Amino acid sequence: QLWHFILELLRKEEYQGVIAWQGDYGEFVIKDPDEVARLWGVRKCKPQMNYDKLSRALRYYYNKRILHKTKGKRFTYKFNFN
DNA sequence: ACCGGAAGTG
DNA sequence: CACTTCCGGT
């Protein structure tokens, strides 16, 4: 799953240059959109992956209450731990 | 950047 | 299903 993959990355320091926790409890910011996508596209063997396609995937999680967007902030989503 | 509909995949 | 692909919107 993607939200899995995100968390997989987010509990490893060796990717803080790419993606890390910021602001509130469950908030996280993608520092390098294009790189992340490349890695997810490596993992899913989909070479033609990019943030546009990944970001759509994320928005589908809004209805499913796993994620939502922190408005105003760039590349900043937040998990639904409630 | 960020959204969400729409059609396709295995 | 859980995305990927595409694209015309805000």
UniProtKB/Swiss-Prot annotation:
| Tissues/organs with expression | Highest levels in testis, ovary, pancreas, and heart.
Residues annotated to bind DNA: 1-80
- Modified how: Phosphorylated by multiple kinases including MAPK1/ERK2 at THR-526. Phosphorylation regulates the activity of ERF.
Top-rank taxon: Eukaryota
Q: Where in the cell is it found?
A: Nucleus
Disease cited in the entry: Craniosynostosis 4: A primary abnormality of skull growth involving premature fusion of one or more cranial sutures. The growth velocity of the skull often cannot match that of the developing brain resulting in an abnormal head shape and, in some cases, increased intracranial pressure, which must be treated promptly to avoid permanent neurodevelopmental disability. Chitayat syndrome: An autosomal dominant syndrome characterized by hyperphalangism, partial syndactyly, bilateral accessory phalanx resulting in shortened index fingers, hallux valgus, brachydactyly, facial anomalies, diffuse bronchomalacia, and respiratory distress at birth and in infancy.
Job description of the protein:
Potent transcriptional repressor that binds to the H1 element of the Ets2 promoter. May regulate other genes involved in cellular proliferation. Required for extraembryonic ectoderm differentiation, ectoplacental cone cavity closure, and chorioallantoic attachment. May be important for regulating trophoblast stem cell differentiation.
* Similarity section: Belongs to the ETS family.
- State what protein this is by name: ETS domain-containing transcription factor ERF
Q: Which organism is the protein's source? A: Homo sapiens (Human)
Question: What is the name of the gene encoding this protein?
Answer: ERF
Tell me the part of the parent protein that is shown.
28 to 109 of 548
